[PDB]
Design a protein around this ligand. Structure first.
Ligand SMILES: Cc1ccc(Nc2cc(-c3ccccc3)ncn2)cc1NS(C)(=O)=O
Length: 373
């Protein structure tokens, strides 16, 4: 393949995201940078922190330009504060280009960096609408497309478990997937927003109004571990997942993520847990497709003891299709054509009985109604 050098350019630890090496400043300073399609800021640890091995030293970068403006990004677990500037940025195992991009130097943080994640910053790949302090701050990818010939497209292959995978920038590598790629529109360019039209557990329709699957939004977000489902959706999904796996009994707190369950090394009875399908709006009127994950995706390994957290959780900002979803698939963020493609990942974790799936087409009527206004 012509994109061979970008293949296997991601690393990570389970539950702690996937990062890419980015080279910042002059002379060069390389950092591990979290790939996050669920935000739009490029920020790097820029002062010492207990959880950082390395950080950005702007004083040592001859090409740093200070924008003279603070920046603050909250999350639900905590936040970070910092200072805006521009500098030279390239990706050794990404496109063969260098751009002047906005960079937020993080000077203080609260529950941002993860002890042992090996990343030292974040690359927000969503759109300028959600960027901080405001949409006037051009995101990394907007700069890249603006300043260079790189096609307005990236693709992600996230290889679950100590993890890895590929971010192909400017195109698609056919060795990363199998079967056809199926596309869903990007409803609006802010988050990577999409429309889920049906949910099945082991083939069984969850029978909820599709409006509920997308209240108040559904997004594809590589910086979130879990499949997050709106309260009402989550409850109905838990109940149906319980009903499908009833040959085994699990404590109430397992389904809530508060309790872990461990099996003896090599014995996890994957086959007693259901497959999960999400149908996505297709590109033609009344046409949909489904993506199907295995419990190998939604049960996350956390001794000769294999422990697992149930990684479908509750949300009150809509559906977040996190690493749990992405890890079954090769995901194409076709920004040029305002759409997202899914194909079966060449690296996804399965067994001899079941494999993750991308299937279509299906007939689904009145899909334009599912989205929140
Ligand atoms: C987008 C994103 C933003 C922030 C973080 N960071 C954290 C930090 C902590 C933490 C908690 C207590 C003490 C120290 C740190 N817990 C969860 N996420 C991870 C991701 N993304 S991710 C989950 O793919 O690594």
């Amino acid at each position: 393949g012509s994109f061979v050098e970008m293949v296997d350019n991601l690393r990570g630890k389970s539950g702690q995201g996937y990062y890419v090496e980015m080279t910042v400043g002059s002379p060069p300073q390389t950092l591990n940078i979290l790939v996050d399609t669920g935000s739009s800021n490029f920020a790097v640890g820029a002062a010492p922190h207990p959880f950082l091995h390395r950080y950005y030293q702007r004083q040592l970068s001859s090409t740093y330009r200070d924008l003279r403006k603070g920046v603050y990004v909250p999350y639900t677990q905590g936040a970070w504060a910092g200072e805006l500037g521009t500098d030279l940025v390239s990706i050794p195992h990404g496109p063969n280009v260098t751009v002047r991009a906005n960079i937020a130097a993080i000077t203080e943080s609260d529950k941002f960096f993860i002890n042992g994640s090996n990343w030292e910053g974040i690359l927000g790949l969503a759109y300028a609408e959600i960027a901080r302090p405001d949409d006037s701050l051009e995101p990394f990818f907007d700069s890249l497309v603006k300043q260079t010939h790189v096609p307005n497209l990236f693709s992600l292959q996230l290889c679950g478990a100590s993890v890895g995978g590929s971010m192909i920038i400017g195109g698609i590598d056919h060795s990363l997937y199998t079967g056809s790629l199926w596309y869903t529109p990007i409803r609006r360019e802010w988050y990577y927003e999409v429309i889920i039209v049906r949910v099945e557990i082991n083939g069984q329709d969850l029978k909820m109004d599709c409006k509920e699957y997308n209240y108040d939004k559904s997004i594809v977000d590589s910086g979130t571990t879990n499949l997050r489902l709106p309260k009402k959706v989550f409850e109905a999904a838990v109940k149906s997942i319980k009903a499908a796996s009833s040959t085994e009994k699990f404590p109430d707190g397992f389904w809530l993520g508060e309790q872990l369950v461990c099996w003896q090394a090599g014995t996890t009875p994957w086959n007693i847990f259901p497959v999960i399908s999400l149908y996505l709006m297709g590109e033609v009127t009344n046409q949909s497709f489904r993506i199907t994950i295995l419990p190998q995706q939604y049960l996350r390994p956390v001794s000769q003891d294999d422990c697992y957290k149930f990684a479908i959780s509750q949300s009150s900002t809509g559906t977040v299709m996190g690493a749990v979803i992405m890890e079954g698939f090769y995901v194409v963020f076709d920004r040029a054509r305002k759409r997202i493609g899914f194909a079966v990942s060449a690296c996804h974790v399965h067994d001899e009985f079941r494999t993750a799936a991308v299937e279509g087409p299906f007939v689904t009527l009145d899909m334009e109604d599912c989205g929140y206004n």
